[PDB]
Structures are given as C-alpha cells and as structure tokens.
From Swiss-Prot:
The hydroxylated prolines promote interaction with VHL, initiating rapid ubiquitination and subsequent proteasomal degradation. Under hypoxia, proline hydroxylation is impaired and ubiquitination is attenuated, resulting in stabilization. Residues 4-64 form the PAS domain. Transcription factor involved in the induction of oxygen regulated genes. Heterodimerizes with ARNT; heterodimer binds to core DNA sequence 5'-TACGTG-3' within the hypoxia response element (HRE) of target gene promoters. Regulates the vascular endothelial growth factor (VEGF) expression and seems to be implicated in the development of blood vessels and the tubular system of lung. May also play a role in the formation of the endothelium that gives rise to the blood brain barrier. Potent activator of the Tie-2 tyrosine kinase expression. Residues 68-111 form the PAC domain. Interacts with HIF3A. Efficient DNA binding requires dimerization with another bHLH protein. Heterodimerizes with ARNT; heterodimer binds to core DNA sequence 5'-TACGTG-3' within the hypoxia response element (HRE) of target gene promoters. Interacts with CREBBP. Interacts with EGLN1. Interacts with VHL. The chain holds residues 240 to 350 of 870 of the full protein. Disulfide bonds: none annotated. This is Endothelial PAS domain-containing protein 1. It comes from Homo sapiens. Expressed in most tissues, with highest levels in placenta, lung and heart. Selectively expressed in endothelial cells. It is linked to Erythrocytosis, familial, 4: An autosomal dominant disorder characterized by elevated serum hemoglobin and hematocrit, and normal platelet and leukocyte counts. It is found in: Nucleus; Nucleus speckle.
C-alpha cells in the first residue's frame, strides 16, 4: 500500500467529551492535544454531522465498537475537515462502566471552509 496518511489517535470518556488527543492534531485540527482533552466534543464535534456522531455514540454505547465515515470535523477557526472515526468503547474491567472511548481519526479531505 505505502501510505503515510493523516491519522491521529483520540480518546474520550463516557460522555465522550475528549480525554486524549494525539500530538498530530496541532497540524490536523489546529487545536492543542491539551486543548481538547478536557472539553465537550459535541460542540466542535461536527456541526451537521454531530447527529451522525450521535448515532455513533448511540451505537457505540452498547456495542463495544463502532464505525463511521466522512464527517465534517470543526477546525480551530471554524473550519471543516472530512474524517472517519474508527470507534471503540474501552470498558472498565473491574467496573464494567465506560472507562474511555478510543477513536481513530482519518483525515481525508483538508480544511473546507463555508
């Protein structure tokens, strides 16, 4: 295949706001890893495609795994980048509660604006 690709690991917790962001995000979404880790995703988490992600969260909440394709992710300045989410819910082994959310983001299209 031979593909570099733009992919950054992400993590959320329960409500999936954002608890971890790969360093690549500075160049991808424009924010800082520490800028996302500790804020609610759903704000910047896609404008019209957040409903799509709601379906994803709705599915992932009790499937342990989820897939989702090209959506618009809000870039730092209100931009939109088209990405896909490889989703998984890591549950606590000792608690069986949603320990975290493991998201793999694939940057397909670059910054689309307006």
């Amino acid at each position: 295949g031979a593909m570099d690709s733009k992919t950054f690991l992400s993590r959320h917790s329960m409500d999936m706001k954002f608890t971890y962001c790969d360093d690549r995000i500075t160049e991808l979404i424009g924010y800082h890893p520490e800028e996302l880790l500790g804020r609610s995703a759903y704000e910047f988490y896609h404008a019209l495609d957040s409903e799509n992600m709601t379906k994803s969260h709705q599915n992932l909440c009790t499937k342990g795994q989820v897939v989702s394709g090209q959506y618009r992710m809000l870039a730092k300045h209100g931009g939109y980048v088209w990405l896909e989410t490889q989703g998984t819910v890591i549950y606590n082994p000792r608690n069986l509660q949603p320990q975290c959310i493991m998201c793999v983001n694939y940057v397909l299209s670059e910054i689309e604006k307006n």
